[PDB]
Structure formats: structure tokens, C-alpha cells
């Protein structure tokens, strides 16, 4: 009776989503055709019974640019989603956020809101929400702000989970992405309990250093992301030795109401090649989980102490494997915790192995673990992004378009203190007593 | 007659409760279908203490399951012997506590505690003569601590003349399972100490301490620990339900253990216990039983007995023994640890003999006594709540459910005063 | 066969293009599970205390045949030949 | 009643014990499975002297093996008779001292010695009345020596009322097995003299000759060497377990063998060993015939006193006559100021397989030379600070090192002056 | 519960192991692909998976891919774990300046990363083994720097070093004197012990005994691999008196400064068809002290002995060992010093040495590996110093090193370092 709806917004949000269902669709059994294969009722969290036969996953895709929507409906996944749920616009925002937050999105969020309630009605144990989108896009952000803003007033105490992919510190695809980057930081901070980094720059390395994929494409990154999402939903659809509910997620990873950004890491991830000559012992695997390079965020953990880490375990892992390996985590001196946190470990156990998309690069392994935690080193990205802003604004380059799109001049100024204020919050928190 | 009802809350309550009735049933010879199949008539005489009488001659244990996450109970029904439990005793919610003692003890449980008490008051009137209570709950979690203590607060208000046994798995610092362990323990300790008359604190780590070295089993699992703890408590009332030389009921064990009104903290012990290799070479005797009893590695608490001075000592064997030899065995032992035993009272070790052993062995013992070492547990819990309290870390949640800073300072106060007074008698001299 | 980048002889000639790199060691066997499985201890904690087996006692030694008496009843019966002595001893 | 526990440490301690009980185990006819299959009624009457009581009728020796290296424990288990011992009584570390005396005495011992100490009281506490502790160890072996001496010191303080017995094999120049030999031996006596009450020295090189010259065995192996000490062992406690004309508890011999306070090192021998024998054939080899297991030559000095043990039936008159005969014929192998310094006893059940046997025990003043050259090499190594830094960086200083020399140096002089004492 | 981690660097260091692992693979019985055909001894040099094959925890490092890939294209594709085969792009070309400051650090970070990853897998690390050849730039620069990092990261953990100094007269290198002298300073106070394996002395042993007139680099290797087994044999199998790694450095070094060692091996009988003999230990031991068979071109008789630890493997009984000790001391040609009345550590193992088939070794029921340290060792250093001194007089080849960032003074530092060490050897042997 526990379920959460999925909301997709933007190009990458949809593209990442496609991998999300492919993995999920395979695991619980429902084929692409949707007819249950030739009961357990463990998939009630993601799917809703149609009464007889196939199932309709709780999905709603949204994007103002038609190409992404068109691709899905001509592929092999046409028989799964309800055709009325694909709300698509006519004119793309062209990365002009103000186009999507003032003039265009407003005419489409309603239908986004309308199907929101309807899906809400069917559920019975609505637990939370998920947002899939990026910040370096005009159309994605503008709608992205509206859904959370609107949803926030409609429901309120209902939880919020944040998955947005920030631009990389050195690599990019647009030229004015930083403006979108901070602006989305202007409003999102007032509606989200969790925030996760997915800087695409770090993701590539996992393909080269370990995956040994010489020429990786976007497709590879998306497949991994779905693993992290599925990694988090195991404790919501099966019996676990120590279950953790979505309530106990902001329960431990949010020391203060404001600080809500986290960085994610998953391991192990090996192809068929390397893994053959490995033990995959819990001692080493957890040893790898904290490796400065396995984290999905291009940040230096060594530049700051730790605050609190929550890790989920799956597979045939035995309880005595974790804590014993858990205590050794403290023993290491290179990682120093914050003074006011006597303990920052949260443990999860379950009896389901990890699923691998057929024909992919991932390879089966009995045991796997995912790491999510909040650290004081996140500030650099906002530290690095913020300074890049003054270069853009120093001569108001590109100012002539956003302002006339419906956005007032002062809007940029106000976010500065919000970003500037956020910086001091981190600097003040870390100080020992 | 002279019986008690069973209520378990939170995931911990169900796992031990699921295990607890497992151990009891096999001793009473009743199949999970509720039908008695014992070989000796003696299995029946005190059968009303734990079971009622229903149609068809079958039996059903008197248990009720309470929590704010249904999955905890559902995993209990399909398990072996899970058909004994009364479905009418099942009650659940759908919101989840999030390991928040504020939400459980103020928002949801109070709305959910009505159903349990109503059913709770049912059997209490149903039972011919209630003798006391026994509630197992975990002080380190979210749902268990609040509704467990809140249910403790309500029930006592009607039966102030009864008794209660509190089995709690207190969290030690070596092994941690949550980031809010230091806080939630403190608040619950405030209510328990004012309402709980007899409570047992068990340390999971030490439970690993006993199993790893004594048991020496290759790889313990969650199934393994439950057996031991359930085994220990299951023998608490052992002599009660069977004929014996010196009847020892919950009431009598009450008198000889609690010297002062507030010091209601004890540690339990079970024996014999050892690895497979010791099975066919070690010798079993009352002297053999007792020595394991006093071993510092036997008590199931992280507190070191050598770190404190014992106050009270009561021993619960099982089987047929010669009272005299056990008399000296307890008698002599008191002689060789005078510094570790209370000095302002002589003969601080009790002997209890019930003719009935535990099935599968001929010598067994349950060790329960009072020692000051527990102050180490409370103290180490003392700073952890404080250590993260100065910056108000992770407080905005707690203040977010009708709770303010005023009470928190109170909770810290009582324990700090609680620990001192418990230690105050440590330096007392006649 | 290994003319250009078509088949495999060694790592040098692979030239993995497009998505990934070809298998090398032996292996992608399609769904073989890597690593030592766990959650195996044999004896159970509940089984620990209840049974408590014992020594079970060994087997004594088997005494040999007594021969001096063997002549005793042999003489009592009434047999004195070497061949007969062969007959009686078996019985 | 008057039962004795056993504790051994180090590779020499572990291996020797694995056979010593084997020699004893054959004595009372007790199977490796632990079931009784004996013949004599007197056989089961004192078995508590070395065996406890276990469920099912099995008897377990009260022996605990302590070491810092896993080689012996896992090796000793696999052999025959390796199942009698308590699986729980085993205690073992994970490092091994690497023949670093201080390592097993101050740093490695101080952390692990709790386990060995833990087991020690439990066995004793069950004893009806403690009679003594028997400890085997080597002064030339590192790990066992480091923990053994500290155990010796630890035992005495808690139990100042019971008698202690220890075994040491002091290395000699002929067979040198470790460059660190000189340092380890010197400190061994300092604590052994201070703590140990009864000590019996065995020189490894001495064993070789006995087998080569008397046994005449083609190939001497460690296994064969261990047996010789086992035969002498039982003679020490032979009468304590079986009846005899004049029983002799371990304390009686100590009372009748130790004349003074700080002369507590004795030389021993066993007979008969061969490749119808009468009493006289025993005595001649008793004080003669190269049977001494110590490099010291008792003809090189005078005897403080001696004791002889006879097993099997004999007429005490011969026992009295022979003892008197030997004293006169070998005056000067007996000093004037200890008239009639021989002790004797009789038992009625001799070794399994031998009719009449004798074990040599006589306090000989010649043992001084064992300290002498062992002392001699020590100064040579010390003079240049050779190998000194190993112990220096593990908690010890040169100040302690010298203190032993004075104690030993004072030890030799006082021991030497007892040879030249005149009345 | 006893393990070791293998570190091989440089083509000389890399190549030596190849014969080392092949001998090791044959000795334990593991198949070339790693799958057991048709216990727990492998745990000393192998770890479980634990359902399948076994793998040596060997790490291979070098700044040139030419040597590395041949292993990826040699007869041993499978065994070694590919992730640990960290390799560089360019070589230092006997340039310690280039191989120790310019490109070495670009791979120093990764190796330790794999080293730590290897350390945690096991639990009973007694000590590592380090290989390196001083007669090279890439090996010298990487090896010394790697040694420096290892000590600080761990500290007291034992380490064994197997160096190979240049031969007295035959040299494949022309700049070896420059690299070798500097290399000595780095390793003098960063590795506990090391031995001497001069090339020439390796050549002689094969000729005088094996009787082969066509020896190449190949043959020497099996000599190297053979030696390791003799020293390590006590670390894996039963013995009358087993010996461990810790009890090699705590017994052989008189003072902290003097910590070099020397090696020997015998008997070495050629693969003929003659009836041979039984080769009793007493006669085998005599062959372990004669200078001609000595593994290095450092005449022990030219100087004096300090302390010797001997290993006998096979079917040796201690009695034969003890007697052999005195007879060696009896001979006047060998003298032990006044401050070392006893200097012998004896270790007896039970396994008969396994001979790699198809080489030149043979199967012998007995053997011995003599490891002794004598004051005479200064002779090799003495000859090295003179070679170094002559070149620097006119500032030769110095210019190709300074411009790569190596400071100028250090050449003064190392040279005084050897002189300080050379003087140290002289004073130790002074009669009391
Ligand atoms: N993970 C992942 N991210 C992608 C992929 N493709 C694009 N992105 C992200 O999308 C970000 C930019 O968003 P946009 O390209 O503006 O997409 P949009 O927000 O819908 O706006 P439009 O371009 O107008 O359609 C880039 O910074 C990428 O990080 C992909 O295939 N995988
Ligand atoms: N024992 C032995 N030594 C070898 C062998 N091959 C090369 N060497 C040693 O390698 C040394 C030469 O060093 P280099 O040529 O610089 O080799 P390197 O240290 O790897 O440096 P680079 O060649 O630049 O990679 C010589 O002194 C030899 O002693 C061999 O097959 N066996
Ligand atoms: N022995 C044992 N202890 C458990 C088990 N599951 C949970 N626990 C203990 O319960 C604690 C978690 O408490 P939790 O269930 O979250 O508290 P609740 O939510 O209020 O019921 C952990 O610290 C464990 O020590 C189990 O299967 N066996
Ligand atoms: N009699 C005898 N002596 C032995 C035997 N094995 C070793 N030794 C002696 O013990 C000494 C070394 O002791 P060691 O084995 O290191 O003892 P440990 O390290 O403490 O266990 C050597 O001087 C040997 O003479 C044996 O089997 N029999
Ligand atoms: Mg788009």
C-alpha cells in the first residue's frame, strides 16, 4: 500500500527516466508488453493494477520540447504508459528559463497539476515524491520550479526528494548554463528536504577507471543512475532485516532544516572482465565505498569533515559483515567527523540481489551497496558556481534576453544573498565548539 | 491464576515476541495449531498463566501486536507457529514513525494507543487474576520507545497495585544503528524510571560478546541472538509454573532485588553456555554452573561487573540439585569477592531451586543481580545526548511536532541526577 | 582470420569501439555469480544449547581365543588325533 | 587429592607436552578417546592427580598450552592423542615474538597474558587441594621464555602457599641455535631464581651423547629426544600416584633436596636404557655411566646432596646397603658438612615395559660452570653492544641489563664458596 | 593466517619475478590459468575467490609498456590481476633525475592505492618483498621513492629488499656508477635489510656446476626464483624448527647502520644421466662456505664473518646440522669474532625443494641456503666508490641530470654517505 509517483521534466530527465523503467520493468516481472508473465503483490509501490491483465506504472512525462516525447511513443515501450499521461507542449523554451517560468510553463503546469491529483486519488499509502530534471536548462528549470512550488502548497507535509544534475565544473553543453544553475538554486532551496549531486563529469570516470569504456556515451550514464534509484527503492517493496521508511531518510540526513544537499555513491560496479578475479568482501567493498574517486560528485571530501552518512546494503550480506567493517571506518584517520556528531552511520539490510539490464556493461554480483551522505565540502560547487556569476554579470552580457522575457532585473540580485547566505551557513556549521 | 499478559511493540517486540512464544510453546507441548501434545501431565498445571481456554480444546497465547509499520507483524504471521496468535489481537497503522519519538509519542500513537488499550483492557478483565506485566521494547528506535513507554504510562494508571517487567535493548556506543540513538534513549529513560518497577537492559554488542567467544559459532544471524535473549527471559518465571522446593514468583523476585525505590535497574544472565567443543569435555555441576554465572563475560550488558560493586544476587537454577551444595556455592562465592559485594548488608546472594530444568539439559541457571557498572552505560549515553545538544543539532524535527526546548533539559537532568544517586551508594560506608 | 580488427588474438588487436571492450580472461558463461557467497554457518543458535551431545563411549577391545582350555574340553570330548583337533577347534 | 596442574609455553613446551602425556597416557592405559580400558585396580585410584572428571566417563588432563605463534597449536592437534585436551583451554596469539625476549616479557605478554592468566585460576579453583604447579619451558627459546618467566612471577604472588615446579633447558656453546642466546639466558635466571622454587636444568647437547653412546640409535630426532625427559618426568611424580613403602610427595623431596634458600637448581638422570638386571647394576650407572642430562661434570666439584628413586619391588636392605656403599667408595661421585645426603623411596609398580628403573636427582655443586660459560658469552656480546638495540627500543634500558650480571655474578661467588666450605 | 605482498619494479625487478612466480606456481601446484586441476598452503602466497581460481597478489610496475605488454602477450595471459598492472608511458633512460622526480610521481599515487587495496584483503601481513636493480634509471628513481613512501605510511612493518648491484667488470650499462651511488643513500635508511646478487657471480655458478656453455639472461632467473623458496620455505610448511620473516632481520644486523646481507645456494647438480650420489648434508654444508660457490663476487676470506643463519631443506636431521656447525668453526680459514661467540641461526624444513621441469636444476633429496653477513662486504662498495669518483672529477654526464631538476649538492651528500658507511664497516671489526 506504499507507493510514490514519478515526475519527469526536461530532456535529460526523460532520457534518464527511460532507463529507470527498463530496469524496474525487468525486475518485478512485468514485461514490455505489460501482460503479467505466464500473487506476491510486492510491486504495489510502483504499479497500479488495472483490474485484469497488464499494469500501468505510476508515471507522468512532461517536456516542452516535442522530440523527447515523440521518441518514446514510436519505440518498443508504447504499450506500457497511458497515452493521456504524455502532456507535451508546442514551442520549446530554447534554454530560456524565463520562457519556461513566466510565459510558457504556466500554460502547461495545470495539466501537469491536473493529472497529479488523479494519480493521487488511486494511491492509498502515498509516501513521497520524486523530481527528475537538471539545472542547466531553461525549459526544465522553469517548469521544475513550478511543479515543486505548486505541489508544495497543495500537499505540504508530504515529503520531497531532489534529483537534479548540476553542470560540471569544467565541462558543459550550453554557454549560459550558470544563470540557470543558480536561479534554480534560488527557489528550490525553499521547497526541498533532500538534494543530491549528479555532476555528469564524475560519472564518466567510473566508466573509464573501472568500467574501462574508452568512448562512453550518455546512454551509459543513464543506466547507472537507474541503479541508484532502484538501489533506494528496495526497502520499500520487500522484506528486509532492518527496514527503513522514506520517513527515516530526511530523518537522519537533515541535521538542520536548510542544509539538504547530499552526494551519492554506489559500488561495486565492474564489468564481466575485472570482477572474475575478486572476492567482493564486505570489508573491501565498504572500503571502496569511501574511496575518494567512487563518489558520484566531483568534490573533495578531504577538504571537509563528515557530518552524517546513511548507507543501504543489499544481497546476501550478513549483519556481522557491516558493523565490523563499519567500525574500521572510524579507525581511518584521513576521514575526520564533525565534533557534534558522535555517530553518523545509518544501516540498511535486505535479501534482494542487484538487477542488471540485459546486454549492458554491468555484471551480476551477490553483494552491492549504495552510499548517500551530507558533507561540508559541497560548498565548493556553489563556491565555484557563484564566482562564475560575477564574470557573466560584470558587463551584463546576455542580460538583454532574460530581463525582457518577464523576469525583473532585481531577481538576480536577491538570489546572490540566498547563495551568499548559504555559503556562510556551511562555514558556520563546521566550526567546532 | 497468578498470571501475566504479553504486549510487544515495535519491530523488536515482534521479533522477540515471535521468538519468545517459540521457546515457551515447545516447553508446553502445544502445536502451533493450539493443541497440546506434551508427554507429561506437568506441562498443564500452570497452563492458564500464559494461555486462555477456547472452543475445540485448542489453545491461543495472550499476545497483542502494536506498531506503526504493518510489515513488522506481517512477517510474524507467515512464520512457523504464527497461527497461534489471535488475529483479533492484531492492530496496525499506516503512517510510519520515521524513528521520531515525538511523532510516535505525541501525534500518531496517542491516536493509535486507544485501540490497543481497549483491547488491552479486554484481557486484563478477561484474566482471572492479573499478577503483573512484562513488556519488551527497544529504546534505540523510533516507534518502539514512544508507544512502548506511552502504553506504559497509560496502563499503570489503572492497575497501580500490579507488577511489570521491562526488557529493553539499550544501545551501546560500539555498534550504532541510527543517528538519533542518543536522543530517543534519553526521553524514554525519563518516563520509564518514573513508571517502570522492574526493567532489564540488554546490550546487543555484548550479545555478540557472549556469542562470538562463548558460543564461538561461525557466523551469527539475527535469528541467533533472539534465541538467547528469549531463553534468558523465558526462564525468569521458570519456577512459577512448576512445583519446586522454594517457590519463586515474579512478586518474590521483586522483593529480594530492588533495595531502593528508584534503583530498578538489573542485569540478567543465563547458563550453561559454551561452544560445541565444550559440549563433550566440560563437566556440568552446580559448582560448574555457578562459575559461569559469575564470569564477567556472561552478563548480557556492556557494563563490566568488575567496574562496579554488586548489590543483590539471586540465582534461578533448573532441575534437581542438593540445596546444601548450592548453599555453599553461593555461600563461598560471596566470600571471595567481598570488595565487589555490598558491605552494609550480609548474605547478598539468593538461592532459588525449582525442580524442573529446561528441556534438553539437566543443569541451567538464570543470573539476575544489581551492580553499579550500569552507570557506565547511562553516563556514556549522558554526553552523547549532550554532545550533539549544544548546537541543537537535528532538533528542528523534534521542535516541529509540538515539542519545545523546555522538557529536553528536564530529561538530561533526571538521568544525571539518576546516575549520581545510583553511584552515591557506591562510596557509602557503614 | 585475425586480419585487421575483426577477431581476437590478444589485447593489442582488440580496438574496442562503440560501447565497450571485449572479454579477455575466460569469462560476456552468461550469468555466473562472482564472489564467495555467505549467510552459511551450519549449526544454529537455537540448536546450540538444546542438544548438547555427549561422549557416547568408545568400543572395548576384543579378547583373543583362549587355548589352554581349548585343549581341556577337547580332551574331555574324546578326540586325540591331529585331524580331529582340526575339527573341534572350528566348532 | 594433592592434584597438580600443568602449564607450558613456547615451541619446546608445546611439543614436549604432546608426548609427556603420551608417556603418561600409556601408563594408566587410557585411550585417546578418553575411555578407560585398564587392568590394575590401583590404576584408577589416584587418576585425579592428573585427570579431571568429564561427562560420559571421559577424563581430560588439566593442561593448558600457551604460545604467541600458531605453529605448535594447530600442529599439535593433528597428531595422535591430540583430542584429549580441552578445546577451550587453548590460548594463542597472532604474532609470535620472533625470539625477542623483551617482546614476550613486557609488550606482547602484557596484552595477551590475560587469557593465559584467565584459564589458570579456573583449573586450580576446581582442585580439592592444590599440590603444585609443573611448568616446562626453555631458557634458550624466545617466545616461550618471555611469557614463561612472567607467568612464573605471576603465579607466586597470588599463591604464596603452594609449591611450584619448573623446567628449563639452558643452551650450551656446543649446540648454538640462536645468536640472541646469550642475552635471553642471563635474564631468565634472574626472575627464575627470584620466583621459581624448584628448577631442573637439561642441556640439549647432553641428550645427543646418551642416545649415541648408550642408545646407539642411528638417527636422533626431536621426537626421540622428547621421550627421555618423559621417563625422568614420571619418576618425579611416580610415587605421588602409586603406593609404596615410603611414599614421597613433591614437598618431601624439596624438603630433603634443597638445603639452603638460593640453591635451587638440580641435575637428573634416568635408567636403565639399553640398545635379569639386579640391584647393583643400577647404582653404578646411577652416579656414573654418562647418564647425566647436564653438561656439568659432578666429578668437577662436590655434591651438596642427592636423592634416588626405586620403582618396582625390592628389598630395602639392598636399597640401604647400596646407598651406604656408594657414599664411602666415592668420597673424592658428599661434602663433610652434610652427612648422609642421599634420599630414597620405593614404589611397587615400575614403568610399563621395564622391571626396575631409577631416576637421578642429586644437588651437585658442579652446576656452577653452567652459569660460568653462559655468563662468559654474555659479556662478549654485551661488551660491544651487539644486538642490544632490539631490547632497548621495546621498553628496556641498559640499566636493567647490568643488574642481572651482578645478581648472577653474586650468584656464582656464593654458590662457588659452598664448594670450598670446610668444617 | 600468514601472508606476504609482492612488489616488483623495473625490468630487472619485473623480469626476476617471472621466473619467481613460475617456480612458485609449479611448487604449490596451481594451474597456469589458475583453475585447480583435480591444504590451505596457497594461503601463504594465494588467496581464495573463493569458488574458482587463485591469484598471486603480485604488483608489476614500470615506466615502459614494452616489458609490461609481453606479460599481456606472453604465456601467462590470465593469472595476474589486470587492474594491478599499472604501467607508465616513457622511461627515464638510466636517468635517476628523470626517473625519480619527473615522471615517477605520476604513478607513485596509483601503486600505493593498489598496495593498500592488497593489504586489507589479507589479515596476517608479516612483511612485503621489494625487488629492484640499481643499475638502471627507471628502477632506481621509482624504487627509491616507493621505498621512501612505504616506510612513512606503515613504519615498523618489516620489509625485505633484493637489490642487484653492477658487476665488477662486465656491465651492460655505461652510467651505472652515477645511478648506483645515489641509490645507496636512499635505501640505506629506508629498508631494513637487503642482499647482494652481482651479475657475474651468477654467471660462474651455472658454468662450474651446471656445465652449460650457452647461458643467457634466462638461466640466472631460475637461480633467483630458487633462492626465494629456500628462505620462504619455512613460512608455509611443517619443520622441526620453523623460522619466520621477523627472525631474519632481528638476528643478522649487529648495529642499526650495518644491515646488508649476502646469499649462497648449493648443491647445484647439472641435469646429466650419471648415478650421482646421496649428497649427505655434512658434505653439502661444506659446499656452502667455499668462496667460489659464493653467490656474489665478494671474497668472504678477504674479510671476516659476522653472523650466519643457515637453512636446510629436505630430509635433514638436526644432529647432522649441529655437528656440521663445529667443523666449520674448527677450520682456521674462517674466523668468528670475539664479540659473537655464537652466530648461527638454523632452520630445518621438511619439503624437498621442487625443481621447475625443463630448466637446468635437478631433483636432490637435500639442499641448503646459506645466508651470512661478513665485514668483507665493503669490497664491493670499495670498488663502486672508485668508479664513481673518477667520473665526477671532470663533471662528466652531470649536465644531463641537473637540467632535469635534481639539485647539485646531493652528489656531495651521497658520496660522503658511502664514506661514512665505509668508515663504519672498518670500526666494527676492530679487535676489542
Ligand atoms: N544524465 C544525462 N544527462 C543529460 C543527457 N542529455 C542531456 N543531459 C543534461 O541536460 C542538461 C541541459 O539541459 P537541456 O539540454 O537544456 O534540456 P532541457 O532542460 O529540457 O532544455 P532544452 O534544451 O530546451 O530541451 C545538460 O547539462 C546535461 O547534463 C543524458 O543523456 N544523460
Ligand atoms: N639478474 C638479471 N638482471 C637483469 C636482467 N636483465 C637486466 N638486468 C639488470 O638490469 C640492469 C640494467 O638496468 P636498466 O637497463 O636501466 O633496466 P631498468 O632498471 O628497468 O631501467 P630501464 O632499462 O630504463 O627500464 C643491469 O645491471 C642488470 O643487472 C636479467 O635478465 N637478469
Ligand atoms: N537482536 C536483534 N535486535 C534487533 C533486530 N532488529 C532490530 N534490532 C535492534 O533494534 C534496534 C532498531 O530499533 P527500531 O526497530 O528501529 O526501533 P522502533 O522503530 O521504535 O521499533 C537496533 O539498534 C537493533 O539493535 C533483530 O532482528 N535482532
Ligand atoms: N628436546 C627438544 N628440544 C627442542 C625440540 N625442538 C626445539 N627444541 C629446543 O628449543 C629451542 C628453541 O625453542 P623454540 O622452538 O623456539 O621454543 P618456542 O619458540 O618458545 O616455542 C632450541 O634451542 C632447541 O634446542 C624438541 O623437539 N626436543
Ligand atoms: Mg529539453
TrEMBL record, chain C:
Domain of life from the UniProt record: Eukaryota
Protein name: Uncharacterized protein
Organism listed in the record: Tetrahymena thermophila (strain SB210)
Residues of the full protein shown: 9 to 99 of 247
